[PDB]
Design a protein around this ligand. Structure first.
Ligand SMILES: CC(=O)N1CCCNCC1
Length: 460
């Protein structure tokens, strides 16, 4: 049996509105309804991994696992294995995989983050799962962010607390948050961003939805506008939305949006909105292709419709040579020329780099760079030709060109990271000086840039 170089991943998000689901939810897992839907000819083909995020989920873990497994068995005739299940309050994530993958999946982690303080701590936050699939790290975050059209800033704060504090993936990657720990990171949920139009425009919005004219609505979608202004989800992708707003429906039909203010809404309007979303971030030059992104039309127990997204995702094998793992391969090396970090920090302290990668026996600390002033006020940390020669564990180009180097720039005084980034070794050429570049972030905010040249030697 050859190891896969691609898998398909199903992501679902559903706010169940504290109601049990209907007896049939197969349309969700088949990516049928509105938007970018899956071809009928694929219906019996199982995805490799199914990741199900719920919010306002009234079921026990056992009740929901039985419904999910029985659903997938009906569709595919496959009995899926439970990889992980984690619940915080009424926020839940389930990971299911094809039985053939049981011995390809390892290092399973779960965690949660509770968002808000006192008033605002009690029901919002995130759950997450990570694991290795052979040589590829996968992370999954299901978040239920703050509700209400006038709380987009709170939602952005909730996002930053989740990416700082969710403890998934390799704990040896200590400088890096979840936005750098995974080959592929999927973040989904009831993110609760709204279409930010006047209340008086409610009936116009409904009209536009009935005409399937989403353009004038998406131009006011708070997640798209906040992402365009770099306020949230920096360096994440989302497929184009071609399905109707998934909130807020009258239950037991999809024919009516319930938007008017009620005691039960805290006298808030719920204009039709794309509350329920799937986003991703993969390391540079890894295969990831969205093959579906849409909402179901036939599941109506909740005031939200379920959302599905499916992906092709590149994966690598668990590589063994005569040498590494357990030693270096003298035939491999990674060199860096003309490198410098540009930092937004107003501070004047010395900096050094740390290089982290599963292609190294352990992380590598550089010497301090030389600080200079940029011509527009910036701090420029020059490394010139001073960065170490990195010694990978395996020199085979079929392995090494698929790897990535995480970079942190750290203060000498405090050893705190000021910026994190990632460089692909998927180069156009080996033994050749080539430009490299990554933005640097800290707590998911842009803090600088790292650029220079790389020269990669493989056994070929
Ligand atoms: C061929 C196949 O795998 N299927 C799965 C669903 C059950 N009935 C038949 C079709």
């Amino acid at each position: 049996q050859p190891e896969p170089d691609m898998i398909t991943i199903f992501i679902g998000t559903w706010n169940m509105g504290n109601a049990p689901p209907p007896k049939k939810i197969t349309s969700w897992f088949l990516s049928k309804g509105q938007g970018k839907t899956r071809d009928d000819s694929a219906d019996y083909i199982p995805h490799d991994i199914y990741v199900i995020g719920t919010q306002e989920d009234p079921l026990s873990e056992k009740e929901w696992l039985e419904i999910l497994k029985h659903s997938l068995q009906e569709i595919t005739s496959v009995t899926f294995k439970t990889v992980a299940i984690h619940t915080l309050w009424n926020i839940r994530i389930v990971v299911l995989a094809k039985p053939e993958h049981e011995n390809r999946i390892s290092h399973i982690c779960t965690d949660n983050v509770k968002t808000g303080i006192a008033n605002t701590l009690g029901n919002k936050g995130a759950v997450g799962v990570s694991f290795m699939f052979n040589g590829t790290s996968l992370g999954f975050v299901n978040s239920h962010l703050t509700s209400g059209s006038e709380k987009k800033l709170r939602r952005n704060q909730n996002y930053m607390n989740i990416l700082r504090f969710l403890a998934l993936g390799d704990k040896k990657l200590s400088p890096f948050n979840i936005t750098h720990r995974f080959t592929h990171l999927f973040w989904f949920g009831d993110l609760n961003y709204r279409v930010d139009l006047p209340t008086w425009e409610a009936e116009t919005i409904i009209q536009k939805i009935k005409q399937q004219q989403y353009a004038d609505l998406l131009s006011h979608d708070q997640l798209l506008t906040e992402r365009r202004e770099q306020k949230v989800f920096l360096h994440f992708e989302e497929e184009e939305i071609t399905f109707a707003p998934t909130y807020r429906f009258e239950r037991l039909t999809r024919d009516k949006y319930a938007y008017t203010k009620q005691k039960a809404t805290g006298m808030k309007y719920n204009l039709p909105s794309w509350c329920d979303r799937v986003l991703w971030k993969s390391y540079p030059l890894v295969h990831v292709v969205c093959q579906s992104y849409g909402s179901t039309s036939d599941i109506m127990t909740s005031d939200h419709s379920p959302v599905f997204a499916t992906f092709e995702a590149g994966v690598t094998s668990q590589f063994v040579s005569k040498n590494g793992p357990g030693t270096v391969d003298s035939q491999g090396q990674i060199e860096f020329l003309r490198c410098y970090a540009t930092l937004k920090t107003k501070s004047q302290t010395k900096f050094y780099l740390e290089f982290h990668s599963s292609c190294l026996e352990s992380f590598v600390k550089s010497q301090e760079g030389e600080n200079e002033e940029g011509s527009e006020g910036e701090l420029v940390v020059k490394f010139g030709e001073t960065l170490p020669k990195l010694k990978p564990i395996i020199s085979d180009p079929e392995y090494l060109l698929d790897q990535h180097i995480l970079i942190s720039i750290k203060s000498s005084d405090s050893d705190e990271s000021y910026g994190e980034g990632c460089i692909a070794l998927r180069l156009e050429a080996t033994e050749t000086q080539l430009p490299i570049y990554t933005p640097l972030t800290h707590h998911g905010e842009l803090t600088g840039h790292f650029q220079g040249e790389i020269k990669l030697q493989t056994s070929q």
